[PDB]
Symmetry: D2
Amino acid sequence: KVALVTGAGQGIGKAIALRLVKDGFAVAIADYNDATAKAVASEINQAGGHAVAVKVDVSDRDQVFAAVEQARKTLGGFDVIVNNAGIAQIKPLLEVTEEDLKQIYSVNVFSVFFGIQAAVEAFKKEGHGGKIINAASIAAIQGFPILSAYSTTKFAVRGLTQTAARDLAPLGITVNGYCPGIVGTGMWEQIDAELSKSIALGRPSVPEDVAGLVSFLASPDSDYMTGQSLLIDGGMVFN
Amino acid sequence: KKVALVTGAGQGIGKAIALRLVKDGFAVAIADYNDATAKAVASEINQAGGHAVAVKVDVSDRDQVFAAVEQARKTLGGFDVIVNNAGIAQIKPLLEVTEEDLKQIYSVNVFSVFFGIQAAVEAFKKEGHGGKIINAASIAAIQGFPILSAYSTTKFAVRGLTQTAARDLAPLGITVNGYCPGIVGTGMWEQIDAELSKINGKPIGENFKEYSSSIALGRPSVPEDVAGLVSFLASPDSDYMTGQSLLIDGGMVFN
Amino acid sequence: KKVALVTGAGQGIGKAIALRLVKDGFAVAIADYNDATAKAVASEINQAGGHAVAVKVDVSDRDQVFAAVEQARKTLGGFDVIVNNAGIAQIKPLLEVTEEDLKQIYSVNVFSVFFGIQAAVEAFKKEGHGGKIINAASIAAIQGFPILSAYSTTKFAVRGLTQTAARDLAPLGITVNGYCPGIVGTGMWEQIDAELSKINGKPIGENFKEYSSSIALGRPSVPEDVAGLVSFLASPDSDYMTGQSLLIDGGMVFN
Amino acid sequence: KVALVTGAGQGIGKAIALRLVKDGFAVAIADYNDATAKAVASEINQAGGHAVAVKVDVSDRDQVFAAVEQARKTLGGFDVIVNNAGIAQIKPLLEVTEEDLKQIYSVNVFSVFFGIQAAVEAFKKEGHGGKIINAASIAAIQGFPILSAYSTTKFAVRGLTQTAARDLAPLGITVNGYCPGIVGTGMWEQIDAELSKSIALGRPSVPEDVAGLVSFLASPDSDYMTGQSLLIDGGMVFN
Ligand SMILES: NC(=O)c1ccc[n+]([C@@H]2O[C@H](COP(=O)([O-])OP(=O)(O)OC[C@H]3O[C@@H](n4cnc5c(N)ncnc54)[C@H](O)[C@@H]3O)[C@@H](O)[C@H]2O)c1
Ligand SMILES: NC(=O)c1ccc[n+]([C@@H]2O[C@H](COP(=O)([O-])OP(=O)(O)OC[C@H]3O[C@@H](n4cnc5c(N)ncnc54)[C@H](O)[C@@H]3O)[C@@H](O)[C@H]2O)c1
Ligand SMILES: NC(=O)c1ccc[n+]([C@@H]2O[C@H](COP(=O)([O-])OP(=O)(O)OC[C@H]3O[C@@H](n4cnc5c(N)ncnc54)[C@H](O)[C@@H]3O)[C@@H](O)[C@H]2O)c1
Ligand SMILES: NC(=O)c1ccc[n+]([C@@H]2O[C@H](COP(=O)([O-])OP(=O)(O)OC[C@H]3O[C@@H](n4cnc5c(N)ncnc54)[C@H](O)[C@@H]3O)[C@@H](O)[C@H]2O)c1
């Protein structure tokens, strides 16, 4: 069984990739950062797993298709895609520009359209169904202040997860999403700095928290679940 | 007299909204990319005793949106309400959606609302008071629709924007709410039904009926249904409501 | 003149709703278990030119609810709107909630709405037309509140009832919607704040303030805020809306 | 590790119980039907697992507490409770009586209050946190026609899951729920008969579908998730 994870060079994506390896997947480590992607892939291969690094800008449709097919050929199948890559824009709502919007929507939303399309083609090529797993956010469930552009892209991903699930279900292809809360990654190590210029369980999130949920969404135990965006936020928003 | 600007007011839901707001006592800027229909609606209002001005604007263009709001503020002598209503539909199987499709529909359906919010906030500040921002979402913003994936995702984005902007702008005394129509017999559903017909081979009208079979109240919607809700959202009775996307869909989805 | 019955109309939100519906032109039945306040509010309406009757009813009693609606229908000469507003709050840590607590609050807050719906539907049929059913939910029906578990669960139940009844009754031309107030300074929050104070030791008023810190618009709610929404829900402008629970909470939760 | 599952004599509850056994739990089979409960418990024990049958009417607070403590003593711990027992009332909205409401609320809602309270006491006794897992329904997310009383009880359970999660999180106790769709069990083999007098994946649900989700909710992989009601309905409602 084969999975491709975008943004897997670090943070949540990396934790997801390592957990899927533990679960028995061969994993394509897809990232625009080929240095971290190759480092993660090498770590997996050293430890006896099976991984390959693929460089891709997920806002580029051709590169997304190329990444999926490369994964499929090299790893010998294709069963799961995790559309995880994304960026945060910490800019006041009134200061958001058209260029900002074009960038963040291409990276956070169009990428998921492209990933869905490429994955479905690979599933068909392999002659079976599959699982599409999308990174949303708590900001996809309740809009977050000063992260206005970001929030709206994650709402769009939530919507995409629903509509794609409806359309692809007859093919035996499911589409679900995960909604992290506040996770101490590089993303929040930039949100932190830009913000300067609630959790029921009473602790911030670690990438492994999300990885555990994605393990379920990649497993047969989630076969009959589709179109859902699941919160693993330590109890911030209830849905 | 308070002042409202309604985008996409040349026809359909926007036109109905504009006419109802006139009835409620607003002076209204009729904003549309279609100059002829905008002028026609404005003329129809002025000849029936109301006060309206036509403003040609492509809402996907930020500079034009600011220009439209400023023109409304100057000509009508105030600015109290903006209705971000203009939008388009795309009808295409998910796997066939192109990057160009996405760039177009997000520009028109989503970026436009960012620009409308920004322009209105600046106008409210120049007028020295708060205000109301009202966004056209959709039932497709609550549950994603089959064969209209691009459209559905833009409306989800508008729903999210309504929430986020409501949080951010509340300290300024500015509220942000949305309306979610169901299946409304406008030019847009004429288009949707026709394009669905080409895809699945069902005769003209049949797709409209099947998408409408889910409606509890047992009839499709008319633009006036939506105008009534927007009247509330433009009135002082909605002053303490913000961040909400309200369904007036005859009972298709419950939220 | 159309006819509305409002339960819990002796004081607080119910009283404000009743007075606003009178302003809108309804004849109103003032329904309350408190006979004195019901009579007082009815008298206050009649002495100011409106038309009202006081009806003593325990809404947890099905026979009394039917009797109250029938009395309203006969005395006021019609029946068009019912507002199921009467309710109580309990304030108690989750692990300390008793079976007797549950039996009481579900009887008053939930079963009452079943009975109101049933009584109103029968009345609408006797009058030979459709109608509007309007239920008091809560922000606690959308997100469960700490230390008010019993109350929160009853309001979730009312939210569900609003949806289910909307589906079932739509063919009869009867709509069912709900309103979700936020933090409203009534006798109920006087009680809640006092009981929370006894639990966590914070001075009177401080719990009310902390529960209100989440409000985007930066002020607690007054009953008039809710009355404005219910005015819309009682008006023809909401005819095509059904099954919805609408938040007017100053921006605490977004739905 | 020890789990108690109510309504485990048959249907979804039984499937949940058997899956938790496979996962390594000792399981208390709790039911008002002691015959089926004892049969399921015996099946588990015969196969090398560890189970005990407990008779309980979950609408009876004292019996719920007694069942939990019996499980705790006999099986040697207490880590998970699954509040699964419930009934359906297929009665027209206008025909619903006060007696109907008293019955269905005591069985479907009060039971979950009681189960939560009893489980928390056992968790404290054992000196650790735990997992509370509640059976909601698709009818808890969108109200279902002609199942009006039922729908409202499941909405209440959804609300209870949220509020209890908020209150119990500081104790390291989580509360989540599962929302089955249309499952071919004895319950729908009564709803079927009373109804007489949409699924994206294009097939009805089997009890094992739900069991897979509950396995996740009983596992460490769900530790950071709380207050959520998760749909596994084959794509009927999206949340
Ligand atoms: N961090 C949080 O608290 C949080 C909360 C909610 C949701 N999320 C979501 O989870 C996902 C992962 O977040 P994270 O915190 O690990 O982020 P991160 O910034 O730590 O990692 C992002 C990774 O994606 C890669 N990437 C960025 N843009 C790319 C592009 N155009 N093409 C290919 N790769 C690209 C980066 O190189 C990086 O390796 C994101 O979608 C984020 O929106 C994160
Ligand atoms: N069933 C429905 O019709 C339905 C349902 C849900 C939501 N909505 C939403 O309601 C809104 C109005 O829909 P409608 O049915 O009245 O549509 P319509 O096609 O009848 O009218 C759209 C109007 O917007 C104008 N417009 C389009 N693009 C523009 C641009 N870039 N700049 C300025 N003006 C532009 C058009 O000229 C036209 O006058 C839309 O946002 C739509 O998404 C409609
Ligand atoms: N912050 C808030 O006050 C708030 C917030 C959300 C929802 N609500 C809901 O709004 C509704 C009105 O609340 P309020 O703040 O005006 O309450 P309140 O306590 O001020 O008034 C309640 C009224 O209901 C009457 N009543 C109580 N039990 C009754 C019974 N069994 N039969 C008949 N009448 C009965 C009382 O006599 C009283 O007149 C309630 O359903 C409440 O749950 C209130
Ligand atoms: N079957 C479905 O399609 C469906 C859909 C959504 C939700 N659910 C929920 O899943 C849960 C399990 O449903 P199911 O279909 O397996 O039901 P079922 O009728 O097949 O099994 C119910 C079990 O609970 C037991 N039980 C009933 N009342 C009890 C009481 N008072 N005390 C103790 N035990 C009692 C019964 O003896 C039986 O063993 C229920 O809560 C139901 O509401 C079911």
